[PDB]
Amino acid sequence: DAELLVTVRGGRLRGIRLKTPGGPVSAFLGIPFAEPPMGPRRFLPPEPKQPWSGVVDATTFQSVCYQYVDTLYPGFEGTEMWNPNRELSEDCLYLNVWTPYPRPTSPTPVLVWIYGGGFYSGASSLDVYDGRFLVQAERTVLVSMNYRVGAFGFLALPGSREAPGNVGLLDQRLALQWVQENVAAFGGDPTSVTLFGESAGAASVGMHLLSPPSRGLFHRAVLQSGAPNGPWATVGMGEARRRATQLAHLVGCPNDTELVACLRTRPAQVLVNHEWHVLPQESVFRFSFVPVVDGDFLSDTPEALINAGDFHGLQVLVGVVKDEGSYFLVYGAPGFSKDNESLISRAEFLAGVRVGVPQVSDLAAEAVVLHYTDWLHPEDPARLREALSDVVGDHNVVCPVAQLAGRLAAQGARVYAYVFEHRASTLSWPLWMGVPHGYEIEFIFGIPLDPSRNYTAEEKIFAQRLMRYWANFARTGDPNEPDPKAPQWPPYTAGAQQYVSLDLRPLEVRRGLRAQACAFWNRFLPKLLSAT
Amino acid sequence: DAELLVTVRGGRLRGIRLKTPGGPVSAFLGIPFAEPPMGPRRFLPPEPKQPWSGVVDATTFQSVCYQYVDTLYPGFEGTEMWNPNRELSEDCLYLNVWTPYPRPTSPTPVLVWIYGGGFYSGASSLDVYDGRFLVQAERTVLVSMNYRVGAFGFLALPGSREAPGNVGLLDQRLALQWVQENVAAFGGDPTSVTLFGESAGAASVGMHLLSPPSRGLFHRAVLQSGAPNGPWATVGMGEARRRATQLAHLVGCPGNDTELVACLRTRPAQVLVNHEWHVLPQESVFRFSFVPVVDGDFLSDTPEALINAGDFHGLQVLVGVVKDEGSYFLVYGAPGFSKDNESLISRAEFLAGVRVGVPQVSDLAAEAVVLHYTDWLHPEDPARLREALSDVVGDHNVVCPVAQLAGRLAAQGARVYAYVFEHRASTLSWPLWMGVPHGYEIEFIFGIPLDPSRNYTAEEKIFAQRLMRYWANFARTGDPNEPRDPKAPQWPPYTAGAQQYVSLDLRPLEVRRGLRAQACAFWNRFLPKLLSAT
C-alpha cells in the first residue's frame, strides 16, 4: 500500500497495517538483520544479513531465541506473560519496526527497545512489548530486536576466536547499525535514537553507554530497573571460563577449539537444561551467562568504566519500581510462594540473606543482617519479609542504579530519575509482592489502551502521561512538558538527588533514592570485602 | 540531744541535726571506716579502722581523696558542682550516714550511694549527693562512702603484691562490710540493702554484682548511666602495667616491681596527680587512666564474659540513661566543640571527632562507625553532625553498655527495670544544645529541688518527690511502682525481646520500647565481630 512496501539496503519488505483504538500504524515484524547463528556459527559474533531477492514477508513475529522456559507455575498470567511465544530457534536474529500512519514527512525520533530477563530469556515478540500504542499516541519510530540469550549469546572462553563472549551484545549492536542505515527509510532520524530497556535490557543500554563502538549509534538512554554495574550483570574472564568449561563437562565433553566444536554439536535444549547448574552457589537473582569483562566489548569492569567515562551532555532517564526485590524471592529463598503469605521466620530470613547475597564472606553477611533486621522486632515475619525483599532489591537493582545516576550526573549528564509506585489493578501477583520487577512496562508501552483488557480508565490516563514523558525525553532529552503548568520533574544530581514518583497522584518530588541503604552497599561493603 | 549520740562497733559518734522544709534528719558525717591508706599503704588493700576511745565528731564531711581537678571552665557552675568541696587528703576513707529524726524503731531499709567520676575523681561530700531529702521524705537509711580514685585506687602492676589493683573497689567493699556490721545501730535493716551509683559509681555497682565476695553484702542494685562492661570502665593487665610504668617513668624512677612501687610510694600525692593524664595510649574523650583491672582476682574474668555466663535469679535491678549521654564529653576534646558556642561542627571535624570518640580501633571499624552515624542526605549539615557525634560518644560508652547488661541480666533471671531520664533541669547552666547531659538526673533522684534556696520551679519538686518514690519503692520491694494501685502508670519490666523502659520527665510515665535498639545492635553485636576479624 506504498505505506506497507519498503526498501532497506538488503531487499524489499511487505509490512502489515495495525489496529489502534485511536489511529492506525504500519509495522514490519521479523526483519532479518543477521545470517542465522548456527552449527559452526553458534557462539560467534553475528554476520550482517546478506542481501535478498524478491520481497520479504514482514507480517509476523519471527522465532524466539533459544532459551530456558518458566516451568514454575505452569499457566499463571504473571509467570507466563514473560515466556516465549513463538517457535524456539537458534535462528532468531530478526527485528521489528513500528512507524506511524501515514509515514511522516520530516525525520522523526526513534525509540529502540532492548528486552529484559537476566540475559537468559526474553523476546521482542511478547505481548507487553507492543509498538502500536506508543508509536501511534506519540509519533516516533520504534524498533525492538531479538538478541541471543543464555549460553548462545553469552558463553565465553575469553581468549578464544571460538566463543569470545558477549555475542548477544554484539547482536544488539548490529541491530543498532541496521538502525543507522535503515531507519531513514521509515521516517526515523538516524541521528535521534533513544535506547531503552529493562532488567538486563537496562543493563544492556548501559553497556552500550560504556562501549565506544556502540556509542555512535544512539544519542539518549533510558535505563529501567537495571544498571550495568549490578552484581548480577557481568562476570569476569575467570568465572566466565570456569563456568563455560564446567558446562562443557556437565554435558559430556571433552584443547580450546576442541571444547567448543565439541559443544557446537550438543542439541540446543540440552545446553538450556544445564544452564543453571554452572552457577556456583545457591542463589536468587544470579544468572549463568551474562556479559563478560574480556577487555574487548567492555574495556574494564563497569564500575571503573563508569567512574571515568565520557558522559558530558548525555541525557539519561533512569528508574526503579517500588518493590524491586519480591518477584525474585519465590525462586530459591526459603519459605516463599505467591500462594501463601510468605511470612518467614528468622532462621529462614538468615539463610535467605546468604542466598540473596551469594558468595560474600560471613562478616559481610552479618553486616547485611545488621542493616536489614529491625532489632526492635527481629521476629515479626511481615518485617522480616519486606526486609529480605529490600535486601534483594537494593543490592541488585536500586543501589546499582542510584550509583550510576550519581556518577553520570557528576560528569555532566542530564539525568532524570523516577520511582514507579503503582500496582496494576490487572495484576496476577499477591498483594504482598507490592509493585514488582517488570510491572512498569505494561504502562510505558501504553498497554491499558487496548480495551480488550481490564484496566481502570484512570490507568489509561496514566499510561498516556508516561508515554508522554518517555516520548518527550526521546524528542528533547527532557521528559517534561516543552508550560510551567504541572509540577516540574527536576534533574537527578549527585547532592540533591531528586527523583519523582510515578503513580496515579501527580508527580511528587522526593530526595534520596534509598540513600542510607546505598551508603552501605556502594561505599562500605566493598571496603569490608577487600579488608577481610 | 542524745538522738545524735550512737555507738558503733568501733566506738562512739556525735552526729548533727539537719533542717528540711518537711522535717529534720540526723546525719553522721565522716565516720572512719579504714586505717589511713598512707605511706607504705598507698596502693594496698584497705585495713578496717580499729576501735578508738572518745567520741568521733561525725558532724561534718571528712576529706576528699586526692584527685585531679578539672579546670576547663574555671568557676563555671556546671563544672564546679563536680570538683572537691573539701581538702584533698590521702587520708580519706570515711563514710556518712543519714537516718530519720525519730530514729526509726522499725528495722528500716538501706540505700548505699557510690559516687561516679571516671574512677579518677569525686567525693561523697558533694552538694548534689545530700541524703537529707531522700531520707526525711521516705524514711530510709542512706550511706555514702569515699573511695580511692585515680592512681591511688586503681593503679595496678597486676600479679605483684604491692600494687594488686582495684583497691578503690576494695575500699567500697569494706564500706559495704561496715554497713552489715553497723547500719543496724542506726535504723537500717542489714537485709534489704540497695546499692546505687552513677557513671563510674554505676559501673562500680556493676562490678559488685559480678564479684562473689561483695555479692553477700547487698540485695538489690541501681545502675544510673553506666555499666561495668562499658569500654572505658576496665583495662586489661597488659595496659594496666604499661600504664603504671609509664607513670613511674614521668615522675622520675626507678626483685624489680617492688622497687618501682616503693619508689612511687615516696612521691607526694600531688605529684602523682599531675602526671595522671599523661599516661593514656592516645587522644580520647571518655577514657581514664587508672580504672579497675581484669586481674583474675576481684574480677574473675572480663566483666562481659562474667555477665554472659552467669545466673542472676533472685536479683532485682533498676537501670537507666539520660537523654543525651554524649554531649557533656565532647566539650573536653572533640574538635570544634564548646559550652560557649553552638558547637556546630564541620564534616571534617566530625570524622576527626569519631577517632577521639572511638579511640584505638581500625580505620575500617571507624568507617563502619561513620556509616551508621551519618545522614547521607545531609552528610554536610552541622547540627546533624553535632547530634550525631554526641550520639556516637553516648551510645558506645553508656547506653549501649547499659542496654547490653540489662538485656543479659533479665534474660538470665534478674528482674530488670529500665528508664530514660529526660528532663532538662530549669537551673541547668549547660548550653541548650547539650540537652539533658550526663550526670544531670542526680539532683532529682536525691531530691535537691526541695531545698528552699535552690530556685527550682515548683512543678520540679513534685518531679523530685515522684522519683524518690520510685527509688525508695525499688529499694524496699525490688519494684518501683506503688504496689497497692492497679490505677497508676505501670513501669514494666525490661526484657530481652520486649525491651521496655519508662520515660522520666514532667509528664506521667510513658512506656517506650527499644533502648536505642538499632545502634546497640551495631555496638554490641556487629562491631566486635568486625574488630576481631580485621
Ligand SMILES: *C1O[C@H](CO)[C@@H](O[C@@H]2O[C@H](CO)[C@@H](O)[C@H](O)[C@H]2NC(C)=O)[C@H](O)[C@H]1NC(C)=O
Ligand atoms: C567555639 O567553637 C569554635 C567554632 O565555632 C571553635 O573553633 C575551633 O576550636 C579549636 C578547639 O577545638 C580551637 O583550637 C580553634 O581556635 C578553632 N579552629 C577553627 C578551625 O576555627 C572554638 O574552639 C570554640 N571556643 C572558643 C570561643 O574558643
Ligand SMILES: *[C@H]1O[C@H](CO)[C@@H](O[C@@H]2O[C@H](CO)[C@@H](O)[C@H](O)[C@H]2NC(C)=O)[C@H](O)[C@H]1NC(C)=O
Ligand atoms: C508457602 O509457604 C510455606 C511456609 O508457609 C513454604 O514452606 C516450605 O517450603 C519448603 C521449600 O522452601 C519445603 O521443603 C517445605 O517442606 C515447606 N514447609 C512448610 C512450613 O510448609 C512453602 O514452600 C510455600 N508453598 C506451598 C503452598 O507449597
